[PDB]
Symmetry: D2
Subunit: 114 residues, 4 copies
């Protein structure tokens, strides 16, 4: 199934934050309505916050996360969770190798903000 794609509330600010846990340099791309809106990169095996940004979900609300290492797309796993019918997290894990820890880049999207 498709992973890393989320329908957010339209026209709404959200946070997107990426963590790295791999020997490989991660590159995380965040697309809003199919166009790159943010790119984060770094290399850490200790959960460094390689990027954090506030974006607007735009007219369609479509947000997609893509991860690559040295130009190779990582395999993604994702889900969205909603607490108290209001607080949202869209969660992404990714695997760049063979150990299947799925933490090589971890991406958390949160809304609402403010």
């Amino acid at each position: 199934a498709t992973q890393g794609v989320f329908t957010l509330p339209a026209n709404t600010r959200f946070g997107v934050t990426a963590f790295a846990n791999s020997s490989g340099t991660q590159t995380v791309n965040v697309l809003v309505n199919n166009e790159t809106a943010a790119t984060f990169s770094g290399q850490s095996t200790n959960n460094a916050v390689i990027g954090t940004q506030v974006l607007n979900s735009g007219s369609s609300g479509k947000v997609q996360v893509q991860v690559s290492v040295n130009g190779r797309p990582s395999d993604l796993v994702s889900a969205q969770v909603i607490l108290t019918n209001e607080l949202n997290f869209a969660l992404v894990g990714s695997e760049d190798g063979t150990d299947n820890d799925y933490n090589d880049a971890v991406v958390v999207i949160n809304w609402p903000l403010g």
Copy 2:
């Protein structure tokens, strides 16, 4: 129901990261085996990262997140989500006021690292 309390695997490193979305200064305290292991403070209405750290869950694996604003305990919501039977997120929202957006401090705990 109790919120913000998670049982991690014993002796395991985990990330903890806090974001703020409120007029009030947030104080986030992270307890491991009932003792304070990290404390973050800050104020933002734009999802600023007010702290990030790597901790070890110790022999008990018990991790607790508490949030207060000017000494007043915030009401918490929480859950844990596991993707592909491997990647764990323990998620906390908190409310310091009347609007019930539950994002006043948002805390993300993730493991495994590395």
Copy 3:
């Protein structure tokens, strides 16, 4: 924070299923737009499906689960999960006593159907 309340898409069929795990007879009420739309009762300590029903979320999409044991409301915990940006689960646990297993009545709401 409020628990057991979910906003579904309007005029949408959903499934609701209740399980019991307690010495006490569980009564599960499912409200749509603040009116009872399904009720299930029973006693099991082995996860009996005390009822399952297909309901329509109607014009408001407001669905609320309430649980009681001989008139006494149980304490609720809930969340919603979305898989592949499409498949929705609204989850409820409840506690009727002191052990905090929160499985005394468990309720799962799922959509879309068909």
Copy 4:
């Protein structure tokens, strides 16, 4: 990533319940320690419960859900979510066709019981 595989605490009773939403007859196999422990089958486009059972997670705790329709495995999506650090849901959706509703067989595993 692998989907439909969950590690439960060892030697723990769990419930498993399957629902159908498709023109096709669903076959759901539940493995414990890599051997079939339960098999459900049925056909419904209205979320009928096609099987429910209580099982033991056994010495390894490894539980796997497989779904087959019209002679081929369906594509699976899954996650585990834990409420109040106590109540566990392991959730599976599956797609037997092209519409990508992922509800064709829906499987809910819950623990602890009793």
